[PDB]
Design a binder for this molecule. Structure first.
Ligand SMILES: [Zn+2]
Length: 257
């Protein structure tokens, strides 16, 4: 399919996925001085109290924590959104060094990692239908900086040894994603795309202004994962981020001044 190496990384993706050079690709640099404050934007409503996590999976590109999305248990509403979006999975992107790893940048600043909480619009019935629609997905993006540990992340870090290689999965129940949220829900929002193939332009991005802090030891453990399957040559899962793409004909809006 695709990868992040010299011979199959983001600069090559357009050959198999021509939408890679499309009009509403992600990630982008958020220029904080040109972003438009929009007083019409509502506060985000994050209702994760009834979330049911199921499983954690190394898919060869990242690790996903998957949720039961067969009912309205963990949903995102409000903000720039119309209707109700259900949480299906979260994952991260990270670097080989603390100075890189995020996909979005803020005034060209990179963070150590970026967390993506992926939600789909319930009007379309399932995730597969939702990705074919311009308002199909909402992805909440949260930056990670290295500093103090995030206690709510530790359950994730501890299980990574069990899913080291591609295709491995493990039961992962009773995880509360509320422990990964910053104090403030102020955000930027713009229309974009998935940042991995198939790169579909179906995402309303909601990128939180406030980063969360994780410890050096926590992010070090992400870097021990493998892109490869068991029994194949070891290649460390690091730098699984796509570089910033042109903004083109889009405006970034801010919920705050
Ligand atoms: Zn992502």
């Amino acid at each position: 399919h695709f990868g992040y190496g010299k011979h199959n990384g983001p600069e090559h993706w357009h050959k198999d996925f021509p939408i890679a050079k499309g009009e509403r690709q992600s990630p982008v640099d958020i220029d904080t001085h040109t972003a438009k404050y929009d007083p019409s934007l509502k506060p985000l409503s994050v209702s994760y109290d009834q979330a049911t996590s199921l499983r954690i999976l190394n898919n060869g590109h990242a690790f996903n924590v998957e949720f039961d999305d067969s009912q309205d248990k963990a949903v995102l509403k409000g903000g720039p959104l119309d209707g109700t979006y259900r949480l299906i999975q979260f994952h991260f992107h990270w670097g080989s060094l603390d100075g890189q790893g995020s996909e979005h940048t803020v005034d060209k600043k990179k963070y150590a990692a970026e967390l993506h909480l992926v939600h789909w619009n319930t009007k379309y019935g399932d995730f597969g239908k939702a990705v074919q629609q311009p308002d199909g997905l909402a992805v909440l993006g949260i930056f990670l900086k290295v500093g103090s540990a995030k206690p709510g992340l530790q359950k994730v870090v501890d299980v990574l040894d069990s899913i080291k290689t591609k295709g491995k999965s493990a039961d992962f129940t009773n995880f509360d994603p509320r422990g990964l949220l910053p104090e403030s829900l102020d955000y930027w929002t713009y229309p974009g795309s998935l940042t991995t193939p198939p790169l579909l332009e179906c995402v309303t991005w909601i990128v939180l202004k406030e980063p969360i802090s994780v410890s050096s030891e926590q992010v070090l453990k992400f870097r021990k994962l493998n892109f490869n399957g068991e029994g194949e040559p070891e290649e460390l899962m690091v730098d699984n981020w796509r570089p910033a793409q042109p903004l083109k004909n889009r405006q970034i809006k801010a919920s705050f001044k």
